[PDB]
Design a protein. Structure first.
Lengths: 152, 158
């Protein structure tokens, strides 16, 4: 399985709290989108294959599996404008994190080639360890804003 | 994109499905009498470790791809409504065969990104084609225009 770093669990709750309880939304478009984040993990240092896979799944799974019910309308709006715009360019770090908790199953045929699964698993965990190390800069309530009384 | 060959038998239905929706403006009756979960189970009962991995995988991709990849524009409001009503139900529990089939014309792009080596990839594709053979074999039952109805007056204006 994909173990989430302990250091990142509290953020997972704060993320859920900001959206779900405080009725706030992550600032869209993102100032530090998924693309940017993946590009930095890459340069830091195949990785290319890893970064592409993460992006593709994110682009498919956001909108379908990574949004809380309170964020749907906000999502409908970004699409309302550009229905073909990439999601990995609009959203940021918190949503990228959500992917890893909703990917443990979305990594589906891999269990077949146990040797590859291990490898891939190794890279996902390392990337996760990367996010964990940089939590300070990546996950912050500063990137969230209260939703307009209209949004409701 | 990884090449997933669609059984010739099923190609005409693919056009009919597209027509029913985008031309005739009909909708697949949604609480599906025979859902993706049901179908996947029938296949499994029909036929292993690989079989169980393939079925579970198909379901995961369906639930992850429906909504953003498998719907024609005219079906989006129906989907949004389904989502508002049942936020806890996986799409494989709501949708049926026609949509399950659409998954196979789009799944190849996703496979393009996978750590499965050559042999393992080959094995996956052989099983995906085996599943398709199963749908084709049961086409008269699984794919029917009779499961579609003209969308209500209220629907078009959405």
């Amino acid at each position: 399985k994909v173990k989430i770093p302990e250091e990142l669990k509290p953020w997972l709750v704060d993320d859920w709290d900001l959206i779900t309880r405080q009725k706030q939304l992550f600032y869209l478009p993102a100032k530090k989108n998924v693309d940017s984040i993946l590009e930095d993990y890459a340069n830091y240092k195949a990785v290319n294959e890893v970064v592409a896979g993460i992006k593709e799944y994110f682009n498919v799974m956001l909108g379908t599996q990574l949004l809380y019910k309170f964020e749907r309308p906000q999502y409908a709006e970004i699409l309302a404008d550009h229905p073909d715009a990439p999601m990995s360019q609009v959203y940021g770090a918190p949503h990228l994190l959500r992917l890893f908790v909703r990917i443990g199953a979305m990594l589906a045929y891999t269990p077949l080639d146990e040797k590859s699964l291990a490898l891939l698993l190794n890279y996902l965990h390392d990337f996760l360890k990367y996010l964990a190390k940089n939590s300070a800069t990546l996950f912050s309530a500063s990137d969230y804003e209260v939703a307009p009384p209209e949004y409701h």
